[PDB]
Symmetry: D2
Subunit: 116 residues, 4 copies
């Protein structure tokens, strides 16, 4: 439960289902290492990406594959993806929810950070 991604569709007023999500972690050599990936469910949510053991301090990138999502609805969108880059767990473990609200030429993203 340390990392959860929630994606909403501003055109339809619905969860954004079947959205691919790739998570990377910056390595010591400054490259982005693949960390976890998955797809949003029918609720627009992606659970089970990581564990509290594996989710150590670091800089993480959550790539939400918005272009692929829109094309499949018949919309040719602006962005390639929405990327969310953040330092995690640097004051000890936290739980992160990364949310995104998608439109064809815009998105909004926020984080809800809680201390267990």
């Amino acid at each position: 439960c340390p990392l959860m991604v929630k994606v909403l569709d501003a055109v339809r007023g619905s969860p954004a289902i079947n959205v691919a999500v790739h998570v990377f972690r910056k390595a010591a050599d400054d490259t982005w290492e693949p960390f976890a990936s998955g797809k949003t469910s029918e609720s627009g949510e992606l659970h089970g990406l990581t564990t509290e053991e594996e989710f150590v301090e670091g800089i993480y990138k959550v790539e939400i594959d918005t272009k692929s999502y829109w094309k499949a609805l018949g919309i040719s969108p602006f962005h390639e993806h929405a990327e969310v880059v953040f330092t995690a767990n640097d004051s000890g473990p936290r739980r992160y929810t990364i949310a995104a609200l998608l439109s064809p030429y815009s998105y909004s993203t926020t984080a809800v950070v809680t201390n267990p």
Copy 2:
């Protein structure tokens, strides 16, 4: 469960707790009649505003008392409130989630509409 309001704080990265919410319904004489009210919980959510029986077709206004919320954090915000005005249930009963993401000089709002 027909109407739920969720409020998030973009400054803190947290639910917006203890936010007053007033719901009105437009009457036949074109006035706004008080319909329901409540406060967001520690999760940022307000449940139990209405019932499927009472929540008939109509034009509804959800007033989120953002100014009061910000002042209590020591911030003098721009808006008096965030108002969300919509026609509900005009193709039969639906479930509505009204979400708002608040900043001192801005907000975003969306709806998730589902058919039970």
Copy 3:
């Protein structure tokens, strides 16, 4: 011009053109009195709503007719309109830009208040 309204379309990536905008001022009896109105230009902007003399401190509402905008594009929208309610304050900066970014089931709004 102390008040300008800017409206953007998040579906097409464009200004929102020919959107009706109505401004109201709260009266002493708590009713909303018509104050100014117009339609957004080809740039998505509505200028010339008021003057410095007329735009006194008080509570104002800007109503943006989003439903009609979407209907004309053939897209079913959620909201009847977008509403922005705020207090004008003499102690703050003097020019108010109310911006709105529209989608069918969501909108975002901000204020840019400058000198």
Copy 4:
């Protein structure tokens, strides 16, 4: 000018001034090559990044240094930066404005693409 970046501050209701912005172009080997950079002006805008000749079709990334912006205001932010990745397309309108509205734990971004 085919590309402009505009940055707004949702906490203060103002342009976001002196924000570093870096633009990259995706190379054939999938690396990001520096393309242009600058700092936002007192209006929150960054003009003059590129020319029509240089801004050929391809994938571009605009990185906005939000963390430094918030740190200078004393506010602890969530993101390292805001990122906007898009394809430039000759068949669409010719002028791209990338706008971002910043909060400490959230941002919104849009594109206004016009002729």
